[PDB]
Amino acid sequence: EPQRLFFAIDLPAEIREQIIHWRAKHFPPEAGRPVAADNLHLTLAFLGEVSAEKEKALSLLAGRIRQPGFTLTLDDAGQWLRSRVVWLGMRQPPRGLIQLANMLRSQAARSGCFQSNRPFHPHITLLRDASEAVTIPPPGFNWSYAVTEFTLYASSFARGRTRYTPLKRWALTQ
Numbered sequence: 001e002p003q004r005l006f007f008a009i010d011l012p013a014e015i016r017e018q019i020i021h022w023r024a025k026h027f028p029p030e031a032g033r034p035v036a037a038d039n040l041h042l043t044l045a046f047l048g049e050v051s052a053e054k055e056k057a058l059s060l061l062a063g064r065i066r067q068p069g070f071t072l073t074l075d076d077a078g079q080w081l082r083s084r085v086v087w088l089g090m091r092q093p094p095r096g097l098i099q100l101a102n103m104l105r106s107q108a109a110r111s112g113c114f115q116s117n118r119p120f121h122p123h124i125t126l127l128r129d130a131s132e133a134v135t136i137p138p139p140g141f142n143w144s145y146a147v148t149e150f151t152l153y154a155s156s157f158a159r160g161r162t163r164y165t166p167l168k169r170w171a172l173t174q
């Protein structure tokens with residue numbers, strides 16, 4: 001059956017907990033719709049609706065990826081008014097993050113995946129449906145962790161929440 005899929009990098013439990021606390025402190029409920037703590041992630045490549053045959057092809061392509069791990073330090077926060085999101089990010093993302101995304105984006109495009117032809121802006125979405133031009137505080141201190149793997153996720157909606165289901169993970173070769 002066709003599953004809406006995407007590749008993502010996840011955050012350690014402690015940092016996610018620090019983020020939702022920082023968010024609740026600086027952003028009122030009317031600033032946007034809050035992303036659940038377990039849904040905090042950094043999307044590497046969106047694939048759109050993809051079937052089992054093509055999912056299997058894309059997984060194989062992901063398995064041939066050979067790339068060392070890298071460190072993410074979240075020193076940047078902002079707001080995209082047109083896309084209507086409040087985001088967390090990195091001013092100077094490591095080349096590894098850029099390399100990994102580009103490797104995965106070019107693999108989906110050569111498999112026949114829906115294309116946006118938009119630049120890759122590594123970010124972690126905190127608020128959705130943000131309309132008003134609120135004010136963005138700097139992120140918390142020392143939101144920095146080592147990236148050890150990336151995951152292929154399935155997107156679904158179950159009883160009033162958005163749910164991401166992990167399917168497969170690939171480690172980065174250190």
Ligand SMILES: Nc1ncnc2c1ncn2[C@@H]1O[C@H](CO)[C@@H](OP(=O)(O)O)[C@H]1O
Nearest residue numbers: 006041042043046048085116123124125
């Ligand atoms: N049709 C589409 N085209 C481009 N990007 C899309 C999309 N549908 C969803 N997205 C985006 O891919 C991520 C899915 O976890 C989300 O990004 P973020 O979670 O905000 O980083 C969607 O906004």
